[PDB]
Short mmCIF file of C-alpha atoms (C1' of nucleotides) and ligand atoms in Angstrom, two decimals:
data_model
loop_
_atom_site.label_atom_id
_atom_site.label_comp_id
_atom_site.label_asym_id
_atom_site.label_seq_id
_atom_site.Cartn_x
_atom_site.Cartn_y
_atom_site.Cartn_z
CA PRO A 1 -132.10 102.61 -52.31
CA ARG A 2 -132.02 105.05 -55.25
CA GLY A 3 -131.14 104.06 -58.82
CA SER A 4 -132.85 104.57 -62.18
CA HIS A 5 -131.92 101.41 -64.11
CA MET A 6 -132.43 99.58 -60.84
CA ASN A 7 -135.27 97.24 -59.84
CA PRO A 8 -135.66 97.18 -56.03
CA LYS A 9 -137.08 93.64 -56.15
CA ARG A 10 -133.58 92.23 -56.79
CA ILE A 11 -132.48 93.36 -53.30
CA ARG A 12 -133.91 92.47 -49.90
CA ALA A 13 -133.00 93.51 -46.36
CA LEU A 14 -131.59 90.88 -44.00
CA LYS A 15 -130.85 93.13 -41.00
CA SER A 16 -131.90 96.73 -40.40
CA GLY A 17 -129.83 99.26 -38.50
CA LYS A 18 -128.12 102.63 -38.55
CA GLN A 19 -126.03 103.23 -41.67
CA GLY A 20 -122.40 103.64 -40.69
CA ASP A 21 -120.17 106.46 -41.89
CA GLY A 22 -117.71 104.04 -43.50
CA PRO A 23 -117.39 102.54 -46.97
CA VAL A 24 -119.89 99.98 -48.19
CA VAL A 25 -118.56 96.41 -48.36
CA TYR A 26 -119.66 93.79 -50.90
CA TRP A 27 -119.37 90.16 -49.75
CA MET A 28 -118.78 88.40 -53.05
CA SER A 29 -119.50 84.69 -52.63
CA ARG A 30 -121.36 83.20 -55.62
CA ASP A 31 -121.02 85.76 -58.45
CA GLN A 32 -117.28 86.14 -59.07
CA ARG A 33 -117.43 88.75 -61.82
CA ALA A 34 -117.12 92.51 -62.18
CA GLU A 35 -119.27 93.09 -65.27
CA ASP A 36 -122.98 92.20 -65.21
CA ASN A 37 -123.16 91.79 -61.43
CA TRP A 38 -126.29 93.16 -59.76
CA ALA A 39 -124.86 92.66 -56.27
CA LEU A 40 -121.76 94.66 -57.22
CA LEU A 41 -123.82 97.24 -59.13
CA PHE A 42 -126.19 97.61 -56.16
CA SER A 43 -123.23 98.03 -53.80
CA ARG A 44 -122.05 100.93 -55.98
CA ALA A 45 -125.51 102.54 -55.92
CA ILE A 46 -125.57 102.95 -52.14
CA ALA A 47 -121.89 103.87 -52.43
CA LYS A 48 -122.76 106.95 -54.49
CA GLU A 49 -125.72 107.95 -52.30
CA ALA A 50 -123.59 107.87 -49.13
CA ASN A 51 -120.54 109.43 -50.87
CA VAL A 52 -118.38 106.47 -49.78
CA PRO A 53 -116.75 104.18 -52.37
CA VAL A 54 -117.40 100.44 -52.42
CA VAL A 55 -114.93 97.81 -51.23
CA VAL A 56 -115.15 94.11 -52.07
CA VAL A 57 -114.30 91.32 -49.63
CA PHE A 58 -113.92 87.58 -50.14
CA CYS A 59 -113.55 84.75 -47.62
CA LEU A 60 -111.68 81.56 -48.53
CA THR A 61 -113.40 78.78 -46.55
CA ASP A 62 -111.96 75.24 -46.03
CA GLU A 63 -114.74 73.91 -48.28
CA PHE A 64 -112.00 73.81 -50.83
CA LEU A 65 -110.51 70.75 -49.10
CA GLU A 66 -113.67 68.79 -49.97
CA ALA A 67 -113.17 69.43 -53.70
CA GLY A 68 -110.03 68.95 -55.80
CA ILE A 69 -107.37 71.02 -57.55
CA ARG A 70 -109.48 71.28 -60.72
CA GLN A 71 -112.06 73.47 -58.98
CA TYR A 72 -109.46 75.23 -56.82
CA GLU A 73 -107.27 76.36 -59.73
CA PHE A 74 -110.30 77.21 -61.87
CA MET A 75 -111.59 79.45 -59.07
CA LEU A 76 -108.34 81.07 -57.89
CA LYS A 77 -107.24 81.87 -61.45
CA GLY A 78 -110.51 83.71 -62.01
CA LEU A 79 -110.00 85.67 -58.79
CA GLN A 80 -106.55 86.87 -59.88
CA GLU A 81 -108.07 88.19 -63.12
CA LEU A 82 -110.95 89.66 -61.09
CA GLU A 83 -108.49 91.41 -58.77
CA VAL A 84 -107.02 93.38 -61.68
CA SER A 85 -110.42 94.21 -63.20
CA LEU A 86 -111.68 95.71 -59.94
CA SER A 87 -108.36 97.54 -59.49
CA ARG A 88 -108.81 99.30 -62.84
CA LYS A 89 -112.06 100.79 -61.50
CA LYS A 90 -110.35 101.87 -58.23
CA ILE A 91 -112.18 99.10 -56.35
CA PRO A 92 -109.94 97.21 -53.89
CA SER A 93 -110.60 93.51 -53.31
CA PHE A 94 -109.70 91.93 -49.96
CA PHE A 95 -109.28 88.15 -49.74
CA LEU A 96 -109.80 86.78 -46.23
CA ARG A 97 -109.35 83.21 -44.99
CA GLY A 98 -111.25 81.26 -42.35
CA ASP A 99 -114.82 81.04 -41.14
CA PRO A 100 -117.05 83.68 -42.80
CA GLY A 101 -119.12 83.85 -39.60
CA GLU A 102 -116.05 85.15 -37.74
CA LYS A 103 -114.01 86.83 -40.50
CA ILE A 104 -116.72 88.94 -42.15
CA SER A 105 -118.12 90.10 -38.80
CA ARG A 106 -114.60 90.99 -37.67
CA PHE A 107 -113.66 92.75 -40.92
CA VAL A 108 -116.73 94.96 -40.51
CA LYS A 109 -115.44 96.24 -37.16
CA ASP A 110 -111.80 96.91 -38.08
CA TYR A 111 -112.63 98.60 -41.39
CA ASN A 112 -115.60 100.46 -39.83
CA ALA A 113 -117.82 99.49 -42.75
CA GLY A 114 -120.98 101.44 -43.49
CA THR A 115 -123.03 98.87 -45.40
CA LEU A 116 -122.68 95.13 -46.02
CA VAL A 117 -124.10 93.61 -49.23
CA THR A 118 -123.87 89.95 -50.24
CA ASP A 119 -125.08 87.81 -53.13
CA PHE A 120 -127.79 85.14 -52.96
CA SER A 121 -127.22 81.39 -52.72
CA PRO A 122 -129.83 78.81 -51.64
CA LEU A 123 -127.18 76.45 -50.21
CA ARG A 124 -127.37 75.50 -46.54
CA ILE A 125 -123.80 76.62 -45.80
CA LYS A 126 -124.58 80.13 -47.08
CA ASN A 127 -127.50 80.68 -44.68
CA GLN A 128 -125.42 79.51 -41.71
CA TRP A 129 -122.74 82.15 -42.33
CA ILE A 130 -125.37 84.88 -42.79
CA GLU A 131 -127.09 84.12 -39.48
CA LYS A 132 -123.77 84.32 -37.63
CA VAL A 133 -122.56 87.62 -39.09
CA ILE A 134 -126.02 89.12 -38.50
CA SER A 135 -125.51 88.50 -34.77
CA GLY A 136 -122.18 90.35 -34.86
CA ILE A 137 -122.80 93.51 -36.88
CA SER A 138 -125.03 96.57 -36.74
CA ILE A 139 -124.70 97.88 -40.33
CA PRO A 140 -127.29 96.63 -42.89
CA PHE A 141 -127.43 93.27 -44.61
CA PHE A 142 -128.70 93.56 -48.19
CA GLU A 143 -128.91 90.35 -50.22
CA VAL A 144 -129.03 90.74 -54.01
CA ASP A 145 -129.85 87.94 -56.46
CA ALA A 146 -127.12 88.59 -59.03
CA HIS A 147 -127.26 85.04 -60.46
CA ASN A 148 -130.85 84.46 -61.59
CA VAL A 149 -132.58 86.73 -64.10
CA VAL A 150 -135.64 86.82 -61.82
CA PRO A 151 -134.97 86.82 -58.05
CA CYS A 152 -135.61 83.47 -56.37
CA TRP A 153 -137.88 84.96 -53.70
CA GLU A 154 -139.80 86.74 -56.49
CA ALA A 155 -140.08 83.92 -59.04
CA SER A 156 -141.93 81.52 -56.74
CA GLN A 157 -143.03 81.63 -53.10
CA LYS A 158 -143.21 77.84 -52.66
CA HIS A 159 -141.54 74.63 -53.81
CA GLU A 160 -142.58 74.12 -57.43
CA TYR A 161 -143.58 70.54 -58.20
CA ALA A 162 -142.31 70.57 -61.80
CA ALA A 163 -141.40 72.88 -64.69
CA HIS A 164 -144.76 73.23 -66.46
CA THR A 165 -146.04 74.91 -63.28
CA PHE A 166 -142.92 77.09 -62.95
CA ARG A 167 -142.53 77.97 -66.64
CA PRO A 168 -145.49 80.43 -66.85
CA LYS A 169 -144.44 82.11 -63.60
CA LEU A 170 -140.91 82.80 -64.87
CA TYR A 171 -141.82 83.88 -68.41
CA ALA A 172 -144.51 86.29 -67.20
CA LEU A 173 -141.94 88.22 -65.13
CA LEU A 174 -139.39 88.24 -67.98
CA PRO A 175 -140.44 91.60 -69.55
CA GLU A 176 -139.84 93.26 -66.15
CA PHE A 177 -136.53 91.69 -65.07
CA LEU A 178 -134.80 90.93 -68.40
CA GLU A 179 -132.95 94.23 -68.86
CA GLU A 180 -129.51 95.52 -69.83
CA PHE A 181 -126.73 95.98 -67.28
CA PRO A 182 -125.59 99.56 -66.62
CA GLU A 183 -121.85 100.17 -66.71
CA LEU A 184 -119.98 99.76 -63.43
CA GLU A 185 -118.94 103.24 -62.28
CA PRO A 186 -115.43 103.49 -60.76
CA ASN A 187 -114.75 104.87 -57.28
CA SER A 188 -114.13 108.50 -56.34
CA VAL A 189 -111.63 108.14 -53.48
CA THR A 190 -109.59 105.00 -52.92
CA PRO A 191 -109.60 104.11 -49.21
CA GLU A 192 -104.05 88.17 -47.73
CA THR A 193 -102.30 87.34 -51.01
CA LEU A 194 -103.73 85.43 -53.96
CA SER A 195 -100.37 84.00 -55.07
CA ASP A 196 -99.67 82.44 -51.66
CA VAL A 197 -103.10 80.94 -50.94
CA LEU A 198 -103.01 79.15 -54.30
CA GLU A 199 -99.65 77.50 -53.60
CA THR A 200 -100.69 76.75 -50.01
CA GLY A 201 -103.92 75.09 -51.13
CA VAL A 202 -102.35 73.13 -53.99
CA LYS A 203 -99.83 71.49 -51.65
CA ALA A 204 -102.72 70.54 -49.33
CA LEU A 205 -104.85 68.67 -51.88
CA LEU A 206 -101.82 67.23 -53.69
CA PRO A 207 -102.13 63.75 -52.06
CA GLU A 208 -105.87 63.75 -52.87
CA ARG A 209 -105.26 64.00 -56.63
CA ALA A 210 -106.89 61.64 -59.12
CA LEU A 211 -103.95 59.73 -60.61
CA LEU A 212 -103.50 57.03 -63.24
CA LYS A 213 -101.53 53.77 -63.13
CA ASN A 214 -98.22 55.58 -63.78
CA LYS A 215 -98.90 58.31 -61.17
CA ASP A 216 -100.13 60.63 -63.93
CA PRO A 217 -102.86 63.17 -63.07
CA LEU A 218 -106.13 62.34 -64.81
CA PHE A 219 -107.50 65.88 -65.06
CA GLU A 220 -106.91 67.87 -68.25
CA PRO A 221 -106.89 71.62 -67.43
CA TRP A 222 -106.60 72.88 -71.04
CA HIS A 223 -110.29 72.32 -71.84
CA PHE A 224 -111.77 75.31 -69.98
CA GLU A 225 -109.73 78.47 -69.45
CA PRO A 226 -111.05 80.18 -66.29
CA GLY A 227 -111.72 83.89 -66.03
CA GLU A 228 -114.24 86.56 -66.96
CA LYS A 229 -112.72 87.36 -70.37
CA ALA A 230 -112.48 83.68 -71.35
CA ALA A 231 -116.10 83.12 -70.30
CA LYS A 232 -117.24 85.81 -72.74
CA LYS A 233 -115.36 84.12 -75.59
CA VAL A 234 -117.16 80.86 -74.76
CA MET A 235 -120.57 82.52 -75.15
CA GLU A 236 -119.62 84.22 -78.43
CA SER A 237 -118.33 80.94 -79.86
CA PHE A 238 -121.48 79.10 -78.75
CA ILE A 239 -123.87 81.62 -80.30
CA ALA A 240 -121.91 81.93 -83.55
CA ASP A 241 -121.05 78.25 -84.04
CA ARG A 242 -123.12 75.98 -81.77
CA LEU A 243 -126.44 77.76 -81.09
CA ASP A 244 -127.95 76.79 -84.45
CA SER A 245 -127.36 73.05 -83.96
CA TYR A 246 -128.23 73.01 -80.25
CA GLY A 247 -131.83 71.84 -80.53
CA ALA A 248 -130.93 68.78 -82.61
CA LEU A 249 -127.64 67.74 -80.96
CA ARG A 250 -128.20 68.72 -77.31
CA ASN A 251 -128.57 65.03 -76.38
CA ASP A 252 -125.57 63.74 -78.38
CA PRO A 253 -122.32 63.56 -76.37
CA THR A 254 -120.21 62.58 -79.41
CA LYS A 255 -120.55 66.16 -80.71
CA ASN A 256 -119.41 69.16 -78.64
CA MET A 257 -122.56 71.18 -79.31
CA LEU A 258 -123.21 72.38 -75.74
CA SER A 259 -122.54 75.91 -74.52
CA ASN A 260 -119.92 74.65 -72.00
CA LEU A 261 -120.90 77.58 -69.76
CA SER A 262 -121.57 75.68 -66.52
CA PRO A 263 -118.05 76.09 -64.99
CA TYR A 264 -118.27 79.85 -65.58
CA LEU A 265 -121.95 79.95 -64.60
CA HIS A 266 -121.35 78.14 -61.30
CA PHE A 267 -118.44 80.26 -60.03
CA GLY A 268 -120.25 83.41 -61.18
CA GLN A 269 -117.55 84.25 -63.72
CA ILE A 270 -120.33 84.96 -66.24
CA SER A 271 -123.89 86.21 -65.80
CA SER A 272 -126.69 83.99 -67.06
CA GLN A 273 -128.73 87.16 -67.62
CA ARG A 274 -126.08 88.43 -70.04
CA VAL A 275 -126.20 85.14 -71.96
CA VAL A 276 -129.98 85.41 -72.35
CA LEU A 277 -129.61 89.01 -73.53
CA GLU A 278 -127.14 87.98 -76.24
CA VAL A 279 -129.16 84.85 -77.06
CA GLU A 280 -132.52 86.64 -77.28
CA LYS A 281 -131.08 89.22 -79.69
CA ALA A 282 -129.41 86.48 -81.76
CA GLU A 283 -131.09 85.29 -84.97
CA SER A 284 -130.80 81.50 -84.76
CA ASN A 285 -133.00 78.42 -85.06
CA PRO A 286 -136.21 79.12 -83.08
CA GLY A 287 -136.37 75.49 -81.97
CA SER A 288 -132.82 75.67 -80.64
CA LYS A 289 -133.58 79.09 -79.13
CA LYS A 290 -136.38 77.83 -76.88
CA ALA A 291 -134.50 74.62 -76.03
CA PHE A 292 -131.46 76.51 -74.75
CA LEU A 293 -133.53 79.22 -73.05
CA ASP A 294 -135.61 76.65 -71.15
CA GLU A 295 -132.39 75.09 -69.83
CA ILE A 296 -130.84 78.36 -68.62
CA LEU A 297 -134.12 80.03 -67.49
CA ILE A 298 -136.53 77.35 -66.29
CA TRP A 299 -134.26 74.50 -65.23
CA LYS A 300 -131.32 76.61 -64.06
CA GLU A 301 -133.49 78.75 -61.77
CA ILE A 302 -135.75 75.92 -60.56
CA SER A 303 -132.61 74.37 -59.06
CA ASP A 304 -132.27 77.48 -56.89
CA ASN A 305 -136.00 77.25 -56.11
CA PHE A 306 -135.64 73.60 -55.08
CA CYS A 307 -132.68 74.36 -52.81
CA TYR A 308 -134.28 77.51 -51.34
CA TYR A 309 -137.57 75.97 -50.15
CA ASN A 310 -136.29 72.44 -49.41
CA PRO A 311 -133.40 72.51 -46.89
CA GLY A 312 -132.87 68.77 -47.34
CA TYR A 313 -132.26 69.06 -51.08
CA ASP A 314 -129.46 66.46 -50.90
CA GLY A 315 -131.46 63.94 -48.85
CA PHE A 316 -134.05 61.23 -49.35
CA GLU A 317 -136.74 63.34 -47.63
CA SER A 318 -136.95 65.94 -50.42
CA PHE A 319 -138.19 63.25 -52.83
CA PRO A 320 -141.91 63.37 -53.71
CA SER A 321 -144.40 61.16 -51.89
CA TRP A 322 -144.91 58.83 -54.86
CA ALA A 323 -141.16 58.36 -55.35
CA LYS A 324 -140.41 57.70 -51.67
CA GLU A 325 -143.07 54.98 -51.44
CA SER A 326 -141.86 53.31 -54.64
CA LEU A 327 -138.20 53.23 -53.56
CA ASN A 328 -139.09 52.09 -50.03
CA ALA A 329 -140.99 49.07 -51.39
CA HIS A 330 -138.09 47.99 -53.63
CA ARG A 331 -135.44 48.17 -50.89
CA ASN A 332 -135.30 44.37 -50.51
CA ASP A 333 -135.05 43.75 -54.27
CA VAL A 334 -131.94 41.84 -55.29
CA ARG A 335 -129.61 44.10 -57.25
CA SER A 336 -128.06 42.71 -60.43
CA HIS A 337 -124.78 44.36 -59.40
CA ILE A 338 -123.47 46.07 -56.27
CA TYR A 339 -120.64 48.61 -56.53
CA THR A 340 -118.99 50.64 -53.79
CA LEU A 341 -117.85 54.27 -53.93
CA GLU A 342 -114.32 53.26 -54.97
CA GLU A 343 -115.53 51.19 -57.94
CA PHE A 344 -117.89 53.90 -59.18
CA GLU A 345 -115.09 56.45 -58.81
CA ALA A 346 -112.51 54.42 -60.76
CA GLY A 347 -114.96 53.27 -63.45
CA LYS A 348 -114.83 49.63 -62.33
CA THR A 349 -118.28 48.64 -63.57
CA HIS A 350 -119.55 46.07 -66.06
CA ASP A 351 -121.02 48.88 -68.19
CA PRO A 352 -118.51 50.37 -70.68
CA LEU A 353 -120.73 53.42 -71.27
CA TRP A 354 -120.99 54.20 -67.56
CA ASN A 355 -117.20 53.86 -67.34
CA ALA A 356 -116.79 56.20 -70.32
CA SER A 357 -119.14 58.66 -68.61
CA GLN A 358 -116.97 58.49 -65.49
CA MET A 359 -113.79 58.68 -67.59
CA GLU A 360 -114.97 61.93 -69.20
CA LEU A 361 -115.78 63.28 -65.73
CA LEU A 362 -112.33 62.40 -64.37
CA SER A 363 -110.31 63.70 -67.33
CA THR A 364 -112.21 66.77 -68.55
CA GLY A 365 -114.09 67.64 -65.35
CA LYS A 366 -117.37 68.15 -67.24
CA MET A 367 -119.59 65.23 -68.21
CA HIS A 368 -122.05 65.70 -71.05
CA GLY A 369 -125.54 66.75 -70.04
CA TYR A 370 -127.27 63.68 -71.46
CA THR A 371 -124.82 61.11 -70.07
CA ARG A 372 -125.08 62.67 -66.60
CA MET A 373 -128.54 61.11 -66.20
CA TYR A 374 -127.37 57.62 -67.18
CA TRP A 375 -124.31 58.05 -64.96
CA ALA A 376 -126.65 58.93 -62.07
CA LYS A 377 -129.53 56.52 -62.75
CA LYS A 378 -127.28 53.46 -63.04
CA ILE A 379 -125.78 54.35 -59.65
CA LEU A 380 -129.22 53.92 -58.09
CA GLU A 381 -129.67 50.65 -59.99
CA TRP A 382 -126.32 49.33 -58.73
CA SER A 383 -126.30 50.48 -55.09
CA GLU A 384 -127.23 48.99 -51.73
CA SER A 385 -129.95 51.50 -50.79
CA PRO A 386 -131.39 54.70 -52.30
CA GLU A 387 -129.55 56.59 -49.55
CA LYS A 388 -126.27 55.00 -50.64
CA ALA A 389 -127.07 55.91 -54.25
CA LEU A 390 -127.62 59.54 -53.28
CA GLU A 391 -124.45 59.40 -51.17
CA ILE A 392 -122.34 58.22 -54.12
CA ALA A 393 -123.95 60.57 -56.65
CA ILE A 394 -123.36 63.78 -54.68
CA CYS A 395 -119.86 62.72 -53.61
CA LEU A 396 -118.79 61.92 -57.17
CA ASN A 397 -120.54 65.05 -58.49
CA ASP A 398 -119.17 67.62 -56.02
CA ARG A 399 -115.63 66.20 -56.22
CA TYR A 400 -114.71 66.04 -59.92
CA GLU A 401 -117.29 68.24 -61.71
CA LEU A 402 -116.13 71.77 -62.48
CA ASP A 403 -119.75 72.81 -61.84
CA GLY A 404 -120.16 70.74 -58.67
CA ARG A 405 -121.43 71.96 -55.30
CA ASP A 406 -124.21 73.81 -57.11
CA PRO A 407 -128.01 73.85 -56.78
CA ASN A 408 -128.01 72.79 -60.44
CA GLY A 409 -126.34 69.57 -59.29
CA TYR A 410 -128.46 68.75 -56.25
CA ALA A 411 -131.68 69.35 -58.20
CA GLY A 412 -130.30 67.44 -61.19
CA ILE A 413 -129.32 64.47 -59.03
CA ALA A 414 -132.69 64.44 -57.24
CA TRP A 415 -134.37 64.37 -60.66
CA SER A 416 -132.43 61.28 -61.76
CA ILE A 417 -132.61 59.44 -58.42
CA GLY A 418 -135.67 60.74 -56.55
CA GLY A 419 -137.90 61.82 -59.43
CA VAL A 420 -137.94 65.45 -58.28
CA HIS A 421 -139.53 67.63 -60.98
CA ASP A 422 -140.44 64.39 -62.78
CA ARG A 423 -143.32 61.91 -62.96
CA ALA A 424 -143.83 58.19 -62.51
CA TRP A 425 -143.01 55.68 -65.25
CA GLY A 426 -143.23 51.95 -65.85
CA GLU A 427 -142.90 49.89 -62.68
CA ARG A 428 -139.54 48.12 -62.47
CA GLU A 429 -137.49 46.19 -59.95
CA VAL A 430 -135.05 48.12 -57.74
CA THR A 431 -135.64 51.34 -59.70
CA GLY A 432 -139.35 51.30 -58.91
CA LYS A 433 -141.38 53.92 -60.76
CA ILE A 434 -138.38 56.24 -61.25
CA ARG A 435 -137.53 57.08 -64.85
CA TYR A 436 -135.48 54.26 -66.37
CA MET A 437 -132.62 54.57 -68.86
CA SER A 438 -131.06 51.59 -70.64
CA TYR A 439 -127.95 50.93 -72.71
CA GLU A 440 -130.11 50.04 -75.72
CA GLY A 441 -131.97 53.34 -75.46
CA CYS A 442 -128.67 55.20 -75.75
CA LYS A 443 -127.54 53.15 -78.76
CA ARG A 444 -130.58 54.21 -80.80
CA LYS A 445 -130.14 57.94 -80.09
CA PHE A 446 -126.38 58.44 -80.58
CA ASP A 447 -123.27 56.53 -81.60
CA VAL A 448 -122.33 55.01 -78.24
CA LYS A 449 -119.25 53.24 -79.61
CA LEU A 450 -117.72 56.58 -80.64
CA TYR A 451 -118.24 57.80 -77.07
CA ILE A 452 -116.54 54.76 -75.51
CA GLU A 453 -113.38 54.81 -77.64
CA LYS A 454 -112.83 58.51 -76.92
CA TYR A 455 -112.63 57.87 -73.15
CA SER A 456 -111.17 54.34 -73.24
"C1'" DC B 1 -159.56 66.34 -67.53
"C1'" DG B 2 -154.91 67.75 -69.95
"C1'" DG B 3 -150.20 67.10 -69.80
"C1'" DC B 4 -146.39 66.73 -68.47
"C1'" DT B 5 -137.52 67.71 -70.45
"C1'" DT B 6 -134.52 65.02 -71.54
"C1'" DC B 7 -138.00 57.80 -70.78
"C1'" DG B 8 -138.40 53.00 -73.94
"C1'" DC B 9 -140.15 50.72 -78.07
"C1'" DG B 10 -142.00 49.48 -82.79
"C1'" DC B 11 -141.60 50.97 -87.60
"C1'" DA B 12 -140.67 53.63 -91.61
"C1'" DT C 1 -133.03 59.30 -87.20
"C1'" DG C 2 -137.86 60.88 -86.52
"C1'" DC C 3 -142.48 59.88 -84.94
"C1'" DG C 4 -146.38 58.00 -82.11
"C1'" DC C 5 -147.51 55.27 -78.32
"C1'" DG C 6 -147.04 53.26 -73.57
"C1'" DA C 7 -146.92 53.60 -68.42
"C1'" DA C 8 -147.58 55.74 -64.77
"C1'" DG C 9 -148.72 59.81 -60.52
"C1'" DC C 10 -150.35 64.38 -59.82
"C1'" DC C 11 -150.45 69.54 -60.12
"C1'" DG C 12 -153.74 73.04 -61.33
"C1'" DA C 13 -156.98 75.34 -64.10
"C1'" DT C 14 -162.08 74.68 -63.31
C1 LIG D 501 -127.29 63.94 -62.11
C2 LIG D 501 -127.04 65.40 -62.58
C3 LIG D 501 -126.05 66.20 -61.99
C4 LIG D 501 -125.78 67.47 -62.47
N1 LIG D 501 -124.71 68.10 -61.91
C5 LIG D 501 -124.67 69.39 -62.23
C6 LIG D 501 -123.74 70.16 -61.56
O1 LIG D 501 -122.91 69.65 -60.64
N2 LIG D 501 -123.57 71.43 -61.85
C7 LIG D 501 -124.32 72.00 -62.77
O2 LIG D 501 -124.18 73.30 -63.06
N3 LIG D 501 -125.31 71.31 -63.37
C8 LIG D 501 -125.45 69.97 -63.21
N4 LIG D 501 -126.33 69.27 -63.88
C9 LIG D 501 -127.25 69.96 -64.74
C10 LIG D 501 -126.88 69.91 -66.22
O3 LIG D 501 -126.50 68.58 -66.59
C11 LIG D 501 -125.71 70.86 -66.48
O4 LIG D 501 -126.10 72.18 -66.15
C12 LIG D 501 -125.16 70.84 -67.91
O5 LIG D 501 -124.99 69.49 -68.33
C13 LIG D 501 -123.86 71.61 -68.03
O6 LIG D 501 -123.42 71.56 -69.40
P1 LIG D 501 -123.71 72.76 -70.39
O7 LIG D 501 -123.76 74.07 -69.61
O8 LIG D 501 -122.75 72.74 -71.52
O9 LIG D 501 -125.17 72.44 -70.92
P2 LIG D 501 -126.07 73.47 -71.72
O10 LIG D 501 -127.00 72.67 -72.63
O11 LIG D 501 -125.20 74.46 -72.42
O12 LIG D 501 -126.90 74.16 -70.59
C14 LIG D 501 -127.00 75.60 -70.49
C15 LIG D 501 -127.16 75.96 -69.04
O13 LIG D 501 -128.48 75.60 -68.59
C16 LIG D 501 -128.42 75.03 -67.29
N5 LIG D 501 -128.83 73.63 -67.38
C17 LIG D 501 -128.54 72.75 -68.38
N6 LIG D 501 -129.04 71.55 -68.20
C18 LIG D 501 -129.69 71.65 -66.98
C19 LIG D 501 -130.42 70.72 -66.21
N7 LIG D 501 -130.62 69.45 -66.57
N8 LIG D 501 -130.95 71.15 -65.04
C20 LIG D 501 -130.75 72.42 -64.67
N9 LIG D 501 -130.08 73.38 -65.31
C21 LIG D 501 -129.57 72.93 -66.46
C22 LIG D 501 -127.00 75.24 -66.78
O14 LIG D 501 -126.89 76.48 -66.09
C23 LIG D 501 -126.20 75.25 -68.09
O15 LIG D 501 -124.97 75.94 -67.97
C24 LIG D 501 -126.58 68.07 -63.47
C25 LIG D 501 -127.66 67.28 -63.95
C26 LIG D 501 -127.87 65.97 -63.56
C27 LIG D 501 -129.04 65.14 -64.18
#
DNA sequence: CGGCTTCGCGCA
DNA sequence: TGCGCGAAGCCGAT
């Protein structure tokens, strides 16, 4: 579909048909940004070829009721800033509400759209909406991978067992797909309220807030400022101040040495490809360079690979054969402690470091990367069944994490609980052959006591 | 056969 | 803290 600085492998056809004489419509779902957006850039390319400007649509689904205010305000505030950035380029953004399978298909008919383009997401709920709107339209369906540097259907054609088998595949395609983003061209001709949906939603999830003893909200919303502009400042501060000391302090939660990009990376408010471009050109510690790149290239995009080829990514069936047999044998093992969902949620466990890990999650909305494994592995060790452990982990992850409901989370949880993209270890009770993490192991690697006192 | 993200453990 | 080893199952280059 035309284009010079345009790789056709980033885009794939989902439904062929006659191209309508109306404007092309971009169904923004996962990448909520104007700059460095392949799906938006590709929508403008066909816009110029057909001499019809691009319009952007968005559907607000009730999946927000499953999460909390922290993710709702972080997402709506970025959309208000996005609405004014697209308006400066003469690109109108339309914010629908309801079922995407019935609202997107309808909006195509009333607006008489000429071409429909959407972003890529390996989640189950994304494929269900696509199959419904396909059966209700006749204009094309082009799906562009604007999140990953290398498209998911191009990086690997099967479920990759681990990273050492996926690392060479990704790095070999890097010189072809790691490129610079062309500038978003504004529209030639020009031819639902964000302020009201925010206040309507907030009053809905108000009773479901996470409160303290004195009816005080636990969440602290001054840690991460949402938006595209604020996301860029986070990257520049990470590269200039934290990139050098990443490789040595990436596993220490007492020091804020992480990029803190996951909330912006999940909602699409910042492009991972842009971060790699700025990182690759940066002159920093080579050890820290590869360590950060492997996290945002190999492990970030294997999560999409795991959720794209395994529909049951959040279930016990996606676990490898060795892990399923080990956990099935240890189902009758007596657990040293048994905690329900309410006790895990409120930090009512005998482990102060697990409670501190939960306390950081409740207050800041972003647990440290290293403590997320201990927070997840101890859940399996202190649960009725491996299914109940997976139930609690996903529920507590998708509810309070600013980067929840992401393939990065489902793959990360399956690694800690089901050994996905991992190997077997010493045989233990309850845990089985799954990788084991202990309190004493954490004490020798970082100052645990400093982590506890910070979060009570 | 070699080697696996992030494991624990003994010992400078 | 930093290093080498242990315990475990299996992909994939041959
Ligand atoms: C049990 C568990 C649950 C997780 N839940 C989520 C989640 O809900 N949402 C989420 O985005 N990630 C999740 N992670 C993955 C990882 O912990 C986070 O991406 C990271 O901690 C976010 O902090 P950061 O961006 O500052 O880390 P950084 O060190 O700055 O990481 C840079 C980027 O690399 C990617 N990345 C980092 N660590 C991992 C990892 N272990 N696996 C895959 N990609 C990674 C992310 O895109 C991240 O933004 C989870 C991991 C585990 C083990």
